[PDB]
């Protein structure tokens, strides 16, 4: 095949820019997908009964006419994260309405409504050919994939792209994803591939690194900076380890809060001490449905004053949002900046705001991450200091039980997939820098 | 008596520093004081029938002995502020919990931990004599006060005194206060008395100004820049009124919610266009105890589009709390700051956080304003651009009437209090500046 | 002619969008032009025996093709800014050097490169067509274009398009500028055209009002605040114009600085008091070519100090470079901030380090503005906050003397250019806004 | 004698709060002294020729009277600053005049106006007495010092208190200085010691700590980052050292330029991999007394970029001044920042501008740090992650000596000279920590 001719060339290590340039494209691509008729067969099932099994497709399908600004990208790997599991069971919405409504832009996003739905919102892969006016990336280079594109045509977003009212996440509100043997997106969302992962391990931070980069590191969100003790609200999570990783490696002390030893092992892992086991210290910060307990906020408080010898956290790293939000301004200190970015427990947050004015704290949303933030997180990934969380890779026909495994958080961290890859393992181009940190890369294993 | 020979000598005009530093002092001073005595004698009621009435005193105290870095002032006027209002009904706790919690620590803070509790935090008058170390100030030097108390010892509160861990606001947290014949004062509280105003007008702004300047027009605020919509909650009142003419004066365009229809006209005297009778409009933002209804968040957010042209507000000034808190969340440009000093009608803050953190907005809590800020305000208030709001003057004997009219939103103005002056019109040495502003110098009457 | 049809269309007052989009496109439009012929032609002698008239040429050049997010735009106007003067000059180098070996990359990039140049990089006209992906702007749609131009596939321009690395600017640094009759401008240059005013002042505040309410009012720049005190230096002039509204509107104090009474008498027009006159001071702040003399600086601080009662400015609008910014660091108060967007005078700068660093001053660069700042500068023009400054109109033809009186100093604000426009006065569809601000609208004239 | 039983209690460990308080003050205390009447023996002579050891006189002296906010120290360890070598010198003007009429301030002020002047402006010592008013600091306390001194009474620097105008560095402007065996200091001077540390080792990181503290790590400096490049300029000397390990720590790339491989390969101890031997490379920034040459800022930016692989620094901590400014200048990422403190060989700064504004890049001056600085860079010692830069102790006695070697580069590191102390190595109360640091604390050796 046509499709196993291109596999060859990345697999070869000698293809040229211009040898890609050359190879041929297939007229189908197998994809993880879904069918615009299967909507409602799951209509009424709890938190674990609706199944995604059922509804992913692998299907044959034509390949998608490019455009200016574009690139296709040979997938190799991808991952199923939360969008992922949350489209395959057609939550909150269906995705085709997505489609359909993102479809009223242009004949060129006209092709995006279709009757089936490309999966998959991350991307590691070789580029094949680029569509008009592209310049910065060549067919044969190795990329990953920022997953919010932006149309950027309202001024709103030129001070920063995550203001743009027009932003979409690639496989989740547009089409052609990265769970597939090939993909399209806009060139403005590859960003180079490091060299020292495997192609399974170099698709799978992805949105949730480059979303605790911005809200940690970037000035956008708390300016984390070297001393800074910022408390983590869930360390060994997606958000929460790439967020421990950066205080670690910014110079930070990070404070970890779990509800595990098996979670609190897996920070130590990491590189953090001071930990918290929320459910091993039975906060209650609610006392009932409308009224919170401040004597369990400030009994966390004083837990978090052991591993400082009395100082408070500079910075709370929140997304729980409801239930912990409460303490997490109570415990700031003065001057202090709490940043949120998710609300998993409920979003309709209360807090006492005497803690808010008194002390000057600020309260900061934050939200993914623009491309410029999503590039420096790569990059603090492609250096060195940041670390992939794989903790399973599938297949990529099996996509299924790849996204039943994340819709009952089966594992501790990322679930990635190989497209075309045959294999785990391939991808590394500088094993030197691969085993200066092979011992953190697999922690989540 | 030595007091009016201390009155006498301001009334003349030409006594100097020699004759107030050889002027005699008196053994007592009359001030309005709480008792500890009756801190809990309105308990268990309606914080509405709680009266400053029952609670307030007309009484003798003896000098406080003068520390470094000190001044005694014979205070001219002062001022009702919302933070006399509730040390006079002991909410949201007595404040004889910190007058004690900061009193007998170093024998210097030792001298306010007193059985009474002398209120007001504002003063303008003239320096009697100065503590040791005192560079910057002699006695008969013309002064208004901040209530900015800070140790600054340490280290925490260099690079903004209000993260002094012992930053304290005068006459609140502090004996000593300002509503009274003599004030007991921190030099570096104090800058020099606007020439052109009066007694009671240069002792009306010190208090809720700095803090509007610093909320609104400082970079530790929201940092207004002209242009910009905001959102002025209790637009005629205290920190409304300066707020308003910051943002006039910044050359953003305010909306003014307001209460009455009289006090509709006073932003329009002022110079706003874009008011909002909150009263009229009817607002019900919460449907019970417990939830609040977003359909009249919109309906807030609709009122203010009328007068922008679709525009959302980048900025709203919020100190209502609670009742207001959720819409002032709702109605923010995306990218906007809800900067909040206060919570008068519950500091139990509830808010979608999801308008908060898809939208990329800031909660921003303020406190105050340190001496720059402070300086600051006061220098515009010197230049003739920003204005006192002075609606109507009280004796030192009926103090406590004002804080009624306050308690209950009365009188939206600033409600002055004579001390030692003993008619209005005293104090203007700078007539033909004074001329100049004179008619919105009267618009609060 | 089919030019003809197009003016025609655009001078009646009800021609539908359809209208625009039936009507057939001219083969070739005028346009004021650069020849890379002469390139080292003029090549010798000083720049001003280098009268602009010489190498300007008015030609006949012809349509190129409409490319995707790409509009072609019917210019009715456009201005002269000195980025002509020294396109025409040649000054530091031939436009054409960084316009020929941009092809080789992509191939939309090498319609750029012609052997001519059309300069221009203003504009007032209407959309004619638009490039592929284009949704919000419409044939019919009156607009004006500022001048950034960037490609944003790079990352770092994703939280500031200005930080693009392939930022150019469009008429000076790309072909098809505003001095045509036809512009082929990116749609992410398109802003509103303020509906009060002509087609010619429409065109005159773009390029620096935006420059300067980047440069004062925006973070990115000095950050005005109320009460500051801001030097202005060519206040009369094109920037300085702006620069000067924004100071007066933003509540701060401007003192200005020019070199004719009449442009000192049109800043007191302006609403400015603190004038000064660099004739009549005869402020040499070189004694050579290698040296300057502090004396000078000091007397400059000296006289700045007169109007602002003993204050330094905080801010110092800077950009005539190497003769006035050795004077501006030393100026500026301490902590002040020094901004900076060009060097007339020429750009080697000299200036004394210890003022900078025991002082806590910044000097900021800045260069134009992002959409974002373009869309908030041009949004206070169009709500009438922000007036244009036209100085004289000529037409197209005429461009070279345009040119060079700006080369000369010979004029005030902003000099316009009719492009398509028959005749000046025509426009505008507010009249009620327009004869709202006419007496400061032709304050310039 | 009276000091032999504080250095006893001292040497003891045991010693509680209640016994250092109980001990008895000596009459006099050792100093190191100038003399008010040899102001001029130096005078027309070499810097190089003029020699401490005979300006040096080893007095006894009376301690001072004890203010309020201030606290007597008992001081093991101080360091020689080159303020203290050219006090010794009597360079530039002569530090007894600043004394004189500082003195004549307040009469606490007026404590300084002496015939002697105890030199010293680091501090490693135990707190004896408190004046009036401290809270923070008790008898018994282990302390180190930040030299700079601020009265406040201006509320200039109640944002920073680097703006305070009356700022002054003690034992350089104030007496009383640490190179005795008492001193006198304020509370809001004092920092706990770093428990790991020897006396001499935590008197050394001192004023060129929190200097590069602030200019890189700060806010108010450069805010660098992780994932940041910084040139860092004279990385082995004071400022470059510490500069150099907050770059590691804060996990940026410092590139480090030295003038020497023996001081490249004291950047590699510390850390640092990128090193640049000024002087190998042979860079003349400057073809003469004037014009500089620009393809040396080019040549620079080459090897720059080898060390990064293409990238460019997003901060160049500068200080060298006049010969390396325009090549920091040059060589800084579009829209990064260069950092400055000091002007060492030549204050008179020449840039080109072009590259200033064009890619908005910042110059930020930075002068000494504020408390909250200092506090912060003392404590990132004590957490380990700073580590002081000691290569030489000297006796008290040979304070004369140790000037000179200063005065004449005879060390890389930094000259300690033990007070009270009688051997290098005491002090050390947390040897763990010591152990896992050691070979980098001694990396000076
Ligand atoms: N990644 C991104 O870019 C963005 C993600 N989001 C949100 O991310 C998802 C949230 O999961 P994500 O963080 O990405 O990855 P995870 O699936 O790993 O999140 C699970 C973590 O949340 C913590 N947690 C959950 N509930 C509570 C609670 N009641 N109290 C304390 N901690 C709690 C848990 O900590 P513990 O171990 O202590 O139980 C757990 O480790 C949302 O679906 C949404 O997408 C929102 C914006 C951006
Ligand atoms: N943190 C700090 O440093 C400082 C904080 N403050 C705070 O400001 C106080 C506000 O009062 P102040 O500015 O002194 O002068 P006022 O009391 O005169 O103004 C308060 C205004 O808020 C409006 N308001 C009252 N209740 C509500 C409500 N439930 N919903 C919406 N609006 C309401 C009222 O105006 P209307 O009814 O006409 O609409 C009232 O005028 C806060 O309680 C607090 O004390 C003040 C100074 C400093
Ligand atoms: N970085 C960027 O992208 C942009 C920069 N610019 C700026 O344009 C120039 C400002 O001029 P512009 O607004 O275009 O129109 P002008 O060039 O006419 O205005 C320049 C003003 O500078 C005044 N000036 C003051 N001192 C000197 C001096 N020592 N030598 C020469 N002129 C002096 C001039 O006369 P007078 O004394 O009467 O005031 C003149 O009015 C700046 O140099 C800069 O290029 C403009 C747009 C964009
Ligand atoms: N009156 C004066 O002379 C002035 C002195 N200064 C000083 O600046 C600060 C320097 O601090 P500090 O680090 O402790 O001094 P150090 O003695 O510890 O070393 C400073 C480093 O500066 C580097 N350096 C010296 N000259 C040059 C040069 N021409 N180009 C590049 N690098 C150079 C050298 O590094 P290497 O040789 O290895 O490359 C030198 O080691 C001082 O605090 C002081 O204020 C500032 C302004 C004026």
């Known amino acids: 095949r046509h499709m196993q001719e291109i596999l060859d060339a990345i697999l070869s290590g000698d293809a040229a820019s211009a040898d890609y340039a050359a190879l041929a494209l297939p007229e189908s691509y197998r994809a993880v997908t879904l069918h615009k008729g299967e909507e409602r067969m799951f209509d009424g099932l709890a938190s674990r009964d609706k199944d995604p099994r059922k509804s992913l497709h692998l299907d044959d399908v034509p390949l998608p006419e490019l455009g200016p600004g574009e690139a296709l990208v040979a997938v190799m790997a ?10 395959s069971i057609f939550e909150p919405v269906s995705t085709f309405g997505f489609l359909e409504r993102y479809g009223r832009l242009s004949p060129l996003t006209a092709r995006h409504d279709l009757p089936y739905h ?4 991350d991307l590691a892969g070789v580029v094949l050919r680029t569509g008009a006016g592209v310049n910065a990336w060549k067919p044969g280079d190795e990329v990953v994939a920022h997953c919010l594109s932006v149309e950027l045509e309202s001024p709103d977003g030129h001070n920063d792209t995550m203001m743009d009212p027009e932003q979409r996440i690639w496989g989740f509100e547009t089409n052609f994803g990265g ?14 591939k490091p060299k020292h992962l495997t192609w399974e391990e170099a698709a799978s931070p992805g949105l949730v690194n480059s979303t605790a980069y911005r809200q940690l590191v970037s000035r956008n969100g708390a300016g984390l900076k070297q001393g800074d003790n910022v408390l983590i609200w869930g360390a060994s999570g997606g958000l929460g380890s790439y967020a421990t990783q950066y205080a670690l490696a910014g110079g930070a002390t990070p404070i970890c809060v779990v509800s595990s030893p098996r979670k609190a092992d897996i920070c130590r892992a990491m590189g953090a001490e001071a930990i918290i086991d929320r459910s091993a210290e039975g906060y209650r910060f609610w006392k009932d449905e409308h009224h ?30 409801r239930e912990t939000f409460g303490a ?9 900046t709490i940043v949120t970015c998710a609300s998993t427990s409920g979003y309709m947050h209360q807090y006492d705001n005497r803690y808010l004015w008194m002390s000057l704290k600020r309260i900061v949303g934050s939200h993914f991450a623009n491309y410029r933030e999503a590039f420096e997180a790569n990059r603090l990934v492609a250096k060195g200091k ?13 996509t299924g039980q790849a996204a039943l495994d994340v819709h009952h958080n089966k594992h501790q961290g990322k679930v990635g997939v190989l497209c075309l890859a045959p294999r785990e393992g391939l991808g590394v181009t500088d094993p030197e820098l691969r085993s200066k940190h092979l011992t953190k890369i697999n922690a989540f294993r």
Chains 1, 2, 3, 4 share one sequence.
Do not use: C, M
């Open 78 to 87: 991808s991952s199923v994260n939360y969008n992922t599991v949350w489209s």
């Open 118 to 121: 490309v999966l998959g919102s």
């Open 179 to 192: 769970l597939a043997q090939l993909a399209l997106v806009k060139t403005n969302q590859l960003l180079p």
């Open 292 to 321: 919170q307990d401040p004597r369990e906020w400030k009994r966390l408080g004083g837990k978090i004053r052991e591993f400082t010898g009395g100082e408070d956290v500079d910075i709370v790293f929140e997304h729980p949002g």
């Open 328 to 336: 997490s301004v109570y415990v700031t200190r003065k001057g202090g």
């Open 386 to 398: 940041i670390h992939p969380t794989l903790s399973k890779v599938y297949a990529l026909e099996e």
